[PDB]
Amino acid sequence: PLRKLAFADLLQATNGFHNDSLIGSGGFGDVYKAILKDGSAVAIKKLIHVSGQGDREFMAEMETIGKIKHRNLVPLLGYCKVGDERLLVYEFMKYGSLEDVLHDPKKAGVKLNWSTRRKIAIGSARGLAFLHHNCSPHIIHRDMKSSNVLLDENLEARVSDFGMARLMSAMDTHLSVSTLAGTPGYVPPEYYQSFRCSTKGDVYSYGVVLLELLTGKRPTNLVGWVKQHAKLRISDVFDPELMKEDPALEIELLQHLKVAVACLDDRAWRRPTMVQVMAMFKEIQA
Ligand SMILES: Nc1ncnc2c1ncn2[C@@H]1O[C@H](COP(=O)(O)OP(=O)(O)OP(=O)(O)O)[C@@H](O)[C@H]1O
Q1: Do 178 and 71 lie in a common domain?
Q2: Which residue's alpha carbon is nearest to atom 23 within ligand 1?
Q3: Domain identity same for 202 and 224
Q4: What one-character DSSP code corresponds to residue 284?
Q5: Domain shared by 73 and 188, yes or no
Q6: Are residue 143 and residue 156 in the same domain, yes or no?
Q7: Which residues define the annotated binding site for ATP?
Q8: What happens without the gene?
Q9: Cα-to-chain-centroid distance, residue 23
């Protein structure tokens, strides 16, 4: 069960929030790696801007990822809400974010061959499909991107960062919101025109991620550049390290590219659902 963690425990597990335990900061707050007094390896997120943008994000995760468990979603282990302080505690994912691995620090890190990236794309997709289909009310993530796909010890994908997620009734096609949420290079185009979000928006953003697995490049655009070279020579867009592995899987890559293109359609009604995406990934291996 989700644990209510005392603020002092988190203070001491991070050595008084010392810089040496900091592994990320900006916008939302801070993220620290720590070992809890019971031995648990965890990531502890310290939210800033409480009683406003910070407290809304806190409740967003509590009402979504804090209420569900799934093999392809980051497990939220605990929380701490003491006055002005807002903290959330997650199981520590060994290999960090997909963005860090994909754009390796000093060109060094874990090498991801196609078999592993394909596993990452299927796991990521199953995570979102659970949010869109199996959860009632459905969950719209609203900020899917490669920094929000974490990789555990087995290089399995686990979707993270529900600070902007929202609940939508199953008897609704969209959710009208107050603000525009998302990251440059991942926003669905219809989010710029309407204060509305949907599972088809998550599908768009998932498409960008699958493109990062296929091309190896950052979204900042990348979506349009692939769409332009898709009508020319689609052999000049995939990650060069994937073609070194085997040029015989270029046919398999193109089929995954078609899945990505369908997710990235400017029309939300034409995008697949994540359940269709999963089924499509399965037909490629059959
Ligand atoms: N459970 C976890 N296990 C291991 N590392 C984590 C975990 N959660 C977060 N991190 C690391 O902390 C950093 C911040 O994570 P978070 O998702 O809160 O930032 P973000 O909003 O995605 O940042 P940005 O999108 O600006 O890169 C990430 O780079 C990630 O690698």
Answers
A1: no
A2: 147
A3: yes
A4: H
A5: no
A6: yes
A7: 23-31, 45, 91-93, 97-100, 143-148, 161
A8: Dwarf phenotype and aberrant leaf shape.
A9: 17
